[PDB]
Amino acid sequence: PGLSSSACGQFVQDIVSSNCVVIFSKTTCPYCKMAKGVFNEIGATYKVVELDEHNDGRRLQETLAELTGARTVPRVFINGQCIGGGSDTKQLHQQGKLLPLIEQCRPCCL
């Protein structure tokens, strides 16, 4: 394959590839607590990157803006695809559309 054009990009590619569910988050953001919440509800473990605990948080926020079209947290990724923020997470879940997205993630043995 190919390499991203910066460490920011690489990092986002990397963690979004190694993980079914990724939440780029802030510890102080209620929409992030909401999204994390629905995932705990489902019983899906996920990877969190707290951008306010990261020395490069602002640069990562910029990269997520370029990739996903919004800089707001949370930026939620299922199976390499950004599904949007907290309301999207919540709303997909309420419509029973989320668990299927999660179920498309390759299985442990693969």
Ligand X SMILES: N[C@@H](CCC(=O)N[C@@H](CS)C(=O)NCC(=O)O)C(=O)O
- Enumerate the known binding-site residues for glutathione: 26, 29, 61, 73, 86-87
Distance CA 17, CA 19 (A): 6
Selected range binding ligand X among 5-13, 17-25, 40-48, 79-87, rule: CB under 6 A: 79-87
> Does residue 78 interact with ligand X by CB under 6 A?
no
> Does residue 60 interact with ligand X by CB under 6 A?
no
Number of chain positions touching ligand X (CB under 6 A): 11
For 79, the enclosing helix (H) or strand (E) is none
* 3-state secondary structure (DSSP) of residue 24: strand
Measured in residues, the chain has a length of 110
> Does residue 63 interact with ligand X by CB under 6 A?
no
Reading across the β-sheet that carries 21-25, which strands appear in turn? 47-50, 21-25, 75-78, 81-84
Q: How far is the CB of 44 from ligand X (least distance, A)?
A: 18
CB-based burial label for 78 (10 Å; 0-12, 13-18, 19+): buried
* 26-55: contacts with ligand X (CB under 6 A): 26, 29-31
- Residue selected from 73, 78, 82, 98 as contacting ligand X according to rule CB under 6 A: 73
Q: Which residues contact ligand X by CB under 6 A?
A: 26, 29-31, 71-74, 85-87
